[PDB]
């Protein structure tokens, strides 16, 4: 057992009835005195290091060639001047095991934290030394963290794509299904998680070329996609991850759900394909009134109306579908379907829940399209247009496939530096740069939507960490007040940066004129409701920072009207799985699952306390499972009212509570305006 | 009096009747002639006598078929079958 591992396991050993949290710091020192420095490749000067990394195909020449060597050296010196130290052993371990650049033989460390941060900053700035230094200060202060794809791959020649969330629309044809399989394979090859909308696909027992009972339904397509994702597994590094979304009014919805039951046969169950269910308000109304619902055959609806079932508003179309004899449907019990969803989520955490009307009543780009489905993490909520992939030697009709750009603000580090505006604007600029530098040659709709929509996702993390280190309970009204104010400022500065970029470049996102930003509707609640903190403690937390008022929001609305907005979407809160370790932060805006987490690496045990955990804030670091899920829903809705896209919202359940409690949490989330529900993790 | 055996090399029951016909020739071969015909090499004769299974034993007297036995038979049953026509 290595010395740092012993020093880390000494945390659980209680002295005077208290955990030895400070020992973790010592572990970090050991982890750097015994391992990191010994296995870190050192060069006589930075010029030799850069030459070795470029020549050995570690880095890219293009992004480094935009700067003189003096500017690169100055950026590296700015990164190293902070003298950044990892506060916990797990932060350094996760960085140097997951993100630090290693040799081809994987035995030596080529990149330190400062080296990786400097390289990512130089990639972000695209030739501006001052902008690169600003990015270096942003990331070495740990105010902003690029996503795992961006952070890991920026500036590296041997790399995947910087985007890992992809949403695909699948049209109801064999050509479109095969193209969707191909694109899913290509994007999994790039290292991205792929979400596919299967609602347009006709159900089982539908007609193909006027022959009856011919379609295999969406379950056969799910089997094909599951095989494709198993095959494309990042060159045998990570398990291929894919998601399938089906509308709850789709006929296959039961069989869809049956793919996640344990009792399902081998020809029914898909193991590497996550599933999500899109629930319009009509289904919730039918379940609430106990009226029996109808699941419709999509192809009959398409034949009768010329549009897909998921392309029209089910609230106004459901009665017409039911009363139409030419539309085929089956009777179902919506309450039984809700209970089945709750039972499946208790068993396996599936499916993801998308409340379609909750997403689309605040969607700014409904003119382009309504949000029909979400991503693999159930936080990307954007307009998508299906593509018509025709036969060979025939021109395809390329639509819009969602692919947003991830990046997370560290709420604790951002607010302690009193730099919400600067961090948000710099993160927006970096996300814009990564979106512009993304070029996928095997996903036509993804590339077209990236060029047109210019959608980015700016998330936040360390919300619970920040609240606990400031003596605020996650379920307290003060925590929700802080979340409201902080995320309203984040939205304000994100919109301001998007409008500034639109003014500078002279271009907005495609079809911006029809958006609620152009009409000023988006700013309505911002020009009438003041989002300043209602509690003195939160106001003192925001001291030293200008909180945008209603007049500031009116000025921003006028600025957006005059200049437009560069990004169709700006904010989405991703789970932030492993980057939260490196940043010494709690994951996403979720409450912490455990105060101290036990992990097993190799044959060794390791202990990670939550950041800033001590005896004084032990009570404020309440575990997520012990919390009231209604108050977690309230906090997530408070944040969601300032996020244009969704939030990865995982439910944290105890084994005692039943499926009725899960359904109640889901219905309260629907009532409170929650857009997506990610997972049902049972303790 | 001739006992004609319609047989084939792949026929299991035809292999079982072979030693029975050798014993029958030792006991009765002064009054009975035993003839074997392979139906895999001699399809025209098998067709002429309407044989459609093997072993098929025909008792012939002066060129005419007087009795027909299909399948395996023990020695005593073949002796009874032939002795009717001696």
């Amino acid at each position: 057992v290595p010395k740092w591992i012993q020093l880390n396991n000494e945390i659980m050993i209680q002295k005077d009835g208290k955990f030895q949290f400070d020992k973790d710091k010592e572990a970090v020192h050991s982890y750097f005195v015994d391992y990191i420095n010994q296995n870190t490749v050192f060069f006589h000067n930075l010029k030799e290091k850069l030459d070795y990394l470029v020549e050995n195909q570690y880095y890219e020449e293009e992004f480094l060639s935009l700067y003189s060597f003096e500017d690169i050296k100055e950026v590296f010196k700015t990164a190293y001047a902070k003298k950044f130290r990892f506060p916990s052993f797990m932060s350094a371990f996760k960085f140097y095991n997951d993100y630090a650049l290693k040799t081809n033989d994987k035995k030596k460390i080529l990149e330190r934290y400062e080296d990786r941060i400097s390289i990512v900053a130089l990639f972000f700035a695209n030739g501006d030394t001052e902008k690169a230094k600003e990015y270096v200060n942003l990331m070495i202060n740990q105010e902003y963290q690029p996503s795992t794809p961006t952070f890991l791959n920026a500036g590296r020649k041997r790399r995947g794509e910087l985007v890992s969330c992809f949403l695909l629309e699948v049209n109801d044809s064999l050509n479109d299904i095969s193209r969707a399989i191909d694109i899913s394979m290509q994007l999994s090859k790039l290292g991205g998680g792929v979400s596919l909308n299967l609602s347009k696909l006709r159900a089982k027992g539908e007609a193909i070329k006027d022959v009856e009972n011919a379609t295999k339904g969406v379950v056969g397509v799910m089997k094909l996609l599951d095989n494709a994702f198993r095959y494309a597994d990042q060159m045998g590094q990570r398990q291929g991850s894919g998601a399938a979304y089906l509308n709850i009014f789709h006929r296959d919805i039961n069989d869809f759900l049956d793919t996640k039951k344990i009792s399902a046969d081998e020809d029914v169950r898909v193991k590497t394909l996550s599933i999500g269910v899109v629930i319009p308000d009509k289904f919730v109304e039918l379940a609430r009134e106990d009226k029996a619902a109808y699941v419709f055959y999509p192809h009959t609806i398409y034949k009768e109306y010329g549009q897909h079932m998921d392309e029209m508003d089910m609230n106004e179309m459901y009665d017409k579908f039911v009363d139409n004899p030419r539309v085929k449907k089956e009777k179902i019990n919506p309450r039984k379907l809700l209970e089945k969803l709750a039972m499946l989520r208790s068993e396996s955490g599936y499916p993801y829940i998308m409340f379609q009307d909750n997403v689309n009543k605040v969607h700014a780009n409904n003119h382009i399209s309504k949000v029909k489905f979400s991503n693999l993490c159930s936080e990307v909520l954007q307009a998508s247009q299906v593509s018509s992939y025709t036969d060979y030697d025939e021109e395809d009709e390329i639509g819009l496939d969602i692919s947003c750009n991830l990046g997370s603000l560290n709420i604790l580090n951002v607010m302690e530096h009193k730099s919400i505006e600067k961090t948000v604007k710099l993160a927006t600029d970096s996300l814009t740069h990564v979106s512009e530098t993304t070029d996928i040659r095997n996903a036509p709709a993804v590339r077209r939507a990236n060029k047109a929509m210019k959608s980015i996702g700016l998330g936040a993390m360390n919300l619970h960490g920040y609240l606990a280190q400031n003596g605020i309970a996650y379920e307290s009204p003060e925590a929700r007040d802080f979340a409201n104010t902080f995320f309203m400022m984040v939205n304000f500065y994100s919109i301001q940066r998007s409008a500034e970029i639109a003014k500078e470049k002279g271009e907005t996102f495609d079809q911006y004129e029809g958006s609620t930003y152009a009409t000023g509707e988006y700013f309505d609640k911002y020009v009438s409701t003041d989002f300043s903190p209602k509690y003195e403690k939160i106001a003192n937390l925001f001291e030293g920072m200008h909180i945008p008022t209603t007049e500031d929001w009116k000025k921003l609305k006028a600025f957006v009207a005059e200049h437009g907005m560069y990004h169709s979407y700006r904010l989405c809160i991703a789970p932030t799985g492993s980057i939260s370790y490196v940043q010494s932060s709690t994951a996403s805006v979720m409450p912490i699952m455990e105060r101290i987490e036990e992990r097993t690496y190799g044959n060794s045990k390791t202990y990670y306390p939550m950041p800033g955990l001590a005896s004084n804030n032990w009570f404020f670091y309440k575990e997520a499972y012990d919390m009231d899920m209604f108050k977690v829903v309230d906090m997530i809705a408070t944040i969601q009212q300032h996020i244009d896209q969704g939030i990865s919202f995982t439910l944290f359940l105890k084994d005692t509570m039943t499926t009725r409690d899960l359904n109640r949490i889901d219905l309260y989330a629907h009532h409170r305006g929650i857009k997506t529900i990610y997972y049902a993790r049972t303790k | 009096v001739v006992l004609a055996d319609f047989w084939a090399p792949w026929c299991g029951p035809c292999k079982m009747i072979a030693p029975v016909l050798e014993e029958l020739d030792q006991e009765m071969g002064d009054k009975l002639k035993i003839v074997k015909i392979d139906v895999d090499e001699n399809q025209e004769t098998a067709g002429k006598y309407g044989v459609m299974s093997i072993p098929t034993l025909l008792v012939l007297k002066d060129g005419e078929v007087v009795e027909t036995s299909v399948g395996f038979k023990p020695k005593e049953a073949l002796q009874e079958l032939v002795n009717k026509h001696l």
Partner: protein, 289 residues
């Protein structure tokens, strides 16, 4: 007063040999002398024979004659354990450690071994002598069964326990300990049923039944001595095993409500060391907040 608790204990003790991976014994087996391996194979083969007959014949026949659905359920479960679990586990051990020819030879050896045939003849004879509605013939068979469970197995159990206690053949030893744990409760249960019948008798009849039990024990004991010498002389352990079987004979007598018959002796300390979520429907009030 006891069947329900035996039912619960038996079903909670349920196991299969496949739960225990046996490839870990491969090396400690390879390292034993030829004499040791021979005795070990033969010992387990003798056990296999006993369990074969206890499962095929002994337990089912006693189940047939004992009244009460719960008593029958316990006896049926015990019967299943004998032939579907215990007897089969020995083949799992054999198939891991030994080549097919050695396995074939040891099963041929059980058929021709005079002590093993004699003990089977005696025990199975008593099982097959049970007469319907005749409690005395049933008692005699239950005594035979207790002697099989609590006495006769032990000349066999000694050797796996002896190795287990030295840290050798520990996976096979784990199986054997599970078998032994089962037989201990089987012997107690059948003992209690035998005592029920004995307690119904006149004092004169009781005196005859004690004579039967003691005469049978002595006859089985004398045969077991010869069996023990035949198996253990080549590994130098016969005297030690003899002490162990006498110890267990006393336990069998006690299971029958009788006083110990053999004097206490020190047993080898090595052998002593060898020992879905809940579902509620949605109410109309859960849709409003």
């Amino acid at each position: 007063d006891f069947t329900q608790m035996f039912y619960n204990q038996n079903v909670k003790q349920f196991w299969l040999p496949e739960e225990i991976a046996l490839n870990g014994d491969l090396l400690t087996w390879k390292y034993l002398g030829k004499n040791e391996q021979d005795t070990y194979m033969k010992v387990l083969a003798g056990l296999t024979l006993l369990d074969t007959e206890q499962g095929n014949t002994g337990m089912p026949i006693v189940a047939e004659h004992v009244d009460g659905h719960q008593r029958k359920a316990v006896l049926n479960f015990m019967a299943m354990m004998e032939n579907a679990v215990h007897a089969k586990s020995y083949s799992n051990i054999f198939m891991t450690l030994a080549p097919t020819e050695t396995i074939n030879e040891v099963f041929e050896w059980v058929k021709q071994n005079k002590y093993l045939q004699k003990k089977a003849q005696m025990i199975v004879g008593l099982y097959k002598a049970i007469q319907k509605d005749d409690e005395i013939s049933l008692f005699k068979a239950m005594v035979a069964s207790v002697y099989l469970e609590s006495f006769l197995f032990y000349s066999g159990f000694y050797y796996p326990l002896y190795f287990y206690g030295q840290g050798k053949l520990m996976q096979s030893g784990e199986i054997i300990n599970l078998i032994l744990r089962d037989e201990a409760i089987h012997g107690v249960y059948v003992g209690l049923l035998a005592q029920e019948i004995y307690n119904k008798q006149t004092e004169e009849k009781k005196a005859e039944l004690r004579e039967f039990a003691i005469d049978l024990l002595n006859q089985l004991y004398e045969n077991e001595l010869e069996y023990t010498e035949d198996l253990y002389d080549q590994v130098g352990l016969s005297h030690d095993v003899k002490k162990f079987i006498r110890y267990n004979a006393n336990k069998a007598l006690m299971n029958l409500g009788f006083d110990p018959y053999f004097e206490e002796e020190d047993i080898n300390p090595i052998v002593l060391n060898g020992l879905k979520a809940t579902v509620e429907p949605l109410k109309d009030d859960d849709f409003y907040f």
